[PDB]
């Protein structure tokens, strides 16, 4: 690609050398914090000036990857390990690599990618390097970022990264919901996330009825099985708060509000799902209504 600076003293080559001296963890944290500082103390990314189509397939694969494997792939790129994604990254231009990392950071901010571990703090050396980068000029900043990030990925004939990075060791945990502490709805949320609908729907009453958004209620246990297995397929929910009270016939009326990060009837990620649960007194959900409350975004 473009000629990378290696050793000319000055300031930019010195900064690039310091970044190289920093280990894999320091380099990855430094690039993440630089992306965080982008637009305020660093140059704004302009992905339109690079052929992002080449990295589009890798980006989609990463997005489809689960968060654990997402972090594993990113750390593999940082460590320059031998992986197909590392090969694909190494087979890119510096601009494409920088745009790919920018897209990864944007997806991490939007939640589509597994984010940085919470409460992480940049090391002293990495923070000093980041301060030097901020002191640098805009063109100097972009040159430093490009040269620092080009070396990542796996390339034949090159092998280092002795420090290495063994990453860091939701659905399995209880769904964090405010004001709702009922085993029936908790199991419903967990089973819906796990997509094991055959075991999920036992929480439904025999006369259980489901109310999909924009559609009339569906009644019948096997009808709800069919609805789950044909419409609600592999979607992730993020319930936020909830209220519970009694209701006529001994029922339990529970209104839960949360966010769905998975494509489900539109308003992707930015739709508030309201679960209206008229649960039977014995516990099984007699009526479940899924209401896709929308933001000012329209055209649903």
């Amino acid at each position: 690609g473009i000629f990378p600076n290696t050793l000319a003293a000055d300031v930019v080559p010195a900064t690039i050398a310091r970044f190289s001296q920093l280990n894999a963890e320091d380099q990855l944290a430094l690039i993440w914090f630089a992306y965080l500082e982008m637009g305020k103390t660093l140059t704004i990314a302009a992905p339109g000036a690079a052929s992002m189509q080449l990295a589009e397939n890798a980006l989609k694969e990463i997005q489809a990857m689960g968060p654990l494997q997402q972090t594993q792939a990113m750390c593999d790129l940082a460590n320059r390990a031998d992986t197909p994604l590392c090969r694909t990254y190494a087979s890119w231009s510096p601009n494409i690599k920088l745009g790919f990392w920018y897209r990864l950071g944007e997806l991490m901010e939007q939640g589509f990618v597994a984010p940085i571990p919470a409460g992480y703090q940049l090391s002293a050396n990495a923070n000093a390097v980041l301060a030097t980068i901020q002191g640098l000029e805009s063109g100097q900043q972009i040159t430093v970022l490009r040269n620092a990030v080009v070396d990542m990925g796996f390339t034949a004939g090159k092998d280092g990264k002795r420090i290495a990075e063994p990453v860091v060791p939701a659905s399995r945990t209880k769904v964090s919901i405010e004001g709702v502490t009922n085993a029936t709805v908790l199991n419903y949320m967990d089973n819906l996330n796990a997509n094991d609908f055959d075991t999920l729907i036992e929480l439904f009453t025999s006369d259980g009825a489901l109310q999909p958004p924009f559609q009339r209620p569906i009644v019948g246990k096997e009808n709800v099985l069919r609805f789950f297995r044909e419409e609600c397929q592999n979607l992730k929910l993020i319930p936020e708060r909830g209220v519970t009270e009694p209701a006529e016939d001994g029922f339990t009326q529970i209104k839960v509000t949360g966010k769905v990060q998975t494509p489900w009837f539109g308003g992707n990620v930015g739709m508030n799902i309201a679960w209206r649960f008229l649960l039977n007194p014995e516990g099984k959900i007699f009526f479940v209504a899924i209401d896709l409350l929308a933001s000012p975004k329209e055209l649903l």
Binding site: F3, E137, G139
Partner: protein
């Protein structure tokens, strides 16, 4: 007068020497003439009246 130990220390590989067409020759000049970029002009397409704001002549 000339000292050879200095150049023995200052030896450089031949393949590392810059040639005529290399942009690294002008890298130093570009560093000297520090170009000032444009501050990003935050603009929202949503707040733009296409029919009226387009020029008429």
């Amino acid at each position: 007068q000339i000292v050879w130990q200095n150049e023995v220390r200052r030896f450089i590989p031949q393949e590392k020497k810059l040639t005529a067409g290399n942009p690294m020759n002008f890298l130093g000049m570009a560093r000297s003439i520090n170009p000032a970029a444009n501050t990003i002009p935050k603009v929202s397409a949503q707040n733009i009246n296409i029919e009226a704001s387009v020029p008429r002549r």
